[PDB]
Design a protein around this ligand. Sequence first.
Ligand SMILES: CC(C)C[C@H](NC(=O)[C@H](CCCC[NH3+])NC(=O)C(F)(F)F)C(=O)Nc1ccc(C(C)C)cc1
Ligand SMILES: [Ca+2]
Length: 240
Amino acid sequence: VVGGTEAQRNSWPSQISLQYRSGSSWAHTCGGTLIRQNWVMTAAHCVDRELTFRVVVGEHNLNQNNGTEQYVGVQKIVVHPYWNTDDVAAGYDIALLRLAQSVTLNSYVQLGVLPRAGTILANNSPCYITGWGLTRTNGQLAQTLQQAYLPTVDYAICSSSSYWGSTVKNSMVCAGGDGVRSGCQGDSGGPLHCLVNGQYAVHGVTSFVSRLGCNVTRKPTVFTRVSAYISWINNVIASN
Ligand SMILES: CC(C)C[C@H](NC(=O)[C@H](CCCC[NH3+])NC(=O)C(F)(F)F)C(=O)Nc1ccc(C(C)C)cc1
Ligand SMILES: [Ca+2]
């Protein structure tokens, strides 16, 4: 997260760190949202490499014991059938991970609230990006969970010339784009939490920023629109 601030420890209890084995240690690669006690929603491109993956819930500082973490292995990955590795701009950047065991819910580990199917936010809606991703373009991962206020940019403004043009679709949410605050590498897969009828719901799964850099003016962070996939998500948990 560029231009973030340190989140409090109990502010976003549905945030997870998706980690892969790195020699003899584990390294963070992506965020995600805990959506059932044994299911994580993350970005499809985070699970394209055929790595062994770890999910950590109750995580606040990647590099030191918090006394709140629960570590669980991924047992099955379900990427969206339409996702194509070569085309982030086509969309469908979403995957569901079934965990080896159910997590214990407490004030640090909670399920994320999903929107009703079809829900589009109006322009400038209050939203927050969270993650441990790079704090600068071509910089380094944060140690502690960062958060940045990233208001949405609706489809018409985002798919316009000056902004993302045709690269964004209606199955995506854009948010931010002020040139100060943004998602950045390592934040992919994570939540965009937007305030809706007094309740924070997860409306985005972080998917991409500009190739020019993370915090670029009129190039908001682009998220997969969760409410475009509620039937797909329910159908996977239903059969799996
Ligand atoms: C905030 C995160 C989401 C940053 C965002 N990352 C991405 O979209 C890529 C997904 C794979 C793209 C394959 N072309 N994600 C990552 O590499 C990450 F580390 F962040 F997880 C990015 O840099 N977006 C981007 C940059 C370049 C491209 C291609 C034109 C190379 C596509 C997307
Ligand atoms: Ca820790």
